[PDB]
Design a protein around this ligand. Structure first.
Ligand code: HEC
Ligand code: HEC
Lengths: 108, 108
């Protein structure tokens, strides 16, 4: 417990504004710059099929739960150096909380 | 120009999360703790009828445009000392920008 639920409403707009450029969340949604994130929670990193991940992601072999996801979202490259995800990150815990609350929900 | 348009999507969720407790935006929406804000832009402060404003608001006699609104939103009491609006404020310009973009739009 180092993650606490935030707004899904608010989570959804941080997603549209900071993640939608490269990712989809819907089941049957396509890979774009980044992979479709449907069902990511509980999945290891680099396993969406038909997506060309970097050696770094695959290797990090991250098991995604709201907690892992929060550290990563703080600073992706610092978390999986070599990842091709080009997003600086979400420095505020409160934002991370709202977005994860949104993802926890829309990736199911 | 010391105000620039932001996300309405994002503006709408800051509103639900930080302003909805006391205000409505829709035409025909009711006064709650705070007055209904439909049509506020271009209106002076303390003029919604059927609302009991403080002597301070009425007196400040603020003409509301996206700019005034931004200063106020930073620190209400510092802006209209004596106001009964009990909201600390929105310190980040970027947030202020998204919410005003939302209000500019939903209060029309
Ligand atoms: C494009 C500029 C991106 C933005 C903005 C965001 N992401 Fe991303 N993401 C992107 C790429 C290219 C990749 C793969 C990197 C690689 O090394 O292969 C990723 C990866 C993810 C992952 C890991 C998924 C997995 O299946 O292991 C997650 C969980 C993820 N991205 C989430 C995510 C969120 C929530 C974003 C907005 C804050 C976001 N990313 C931005 C590309 C881009
Ligand atoms: C309740 C705890 C409130 C919250 C949260 C917000 N507002 Fe408010 N607002 C509230 C009151 C009691 C009043 C009247 C104060 C008085 O002295 O009479 C106000 C007033 C406004 C105004 C001025 C309206 C006018 O017609 O002159 C505006 C523009 C306004 N409030 C906006 C607003 C926004 C955008 C908020 C969320 C960030 C918000 N307020 C929070 C009560 C409460």
């Amino acid at each position: 417990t180092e993650f606490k639920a935030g707004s899904a409403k608010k989570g959804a707009t941080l997603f549209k504004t900071r993640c939608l450029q490269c990712h989809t969340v819907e089941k049957g949604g396509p890979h774009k710059v980044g992979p479709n994130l449907h069902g990511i929670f509980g999945r290891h990193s680099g396993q969406a099929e038909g997506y060309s991940y970097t050696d770094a992601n695959i290797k990090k072999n991250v098991l995604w739960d709201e907690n892992n996801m929060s550290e990563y979202l703080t600073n992706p490259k610092k978390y999986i150096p070599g990842t091709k995800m080009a997003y600086g990150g979400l420095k505020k815990e409160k934002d991370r909380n709202d977005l994860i609350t949104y993802l926890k929900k829309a990736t199911e």
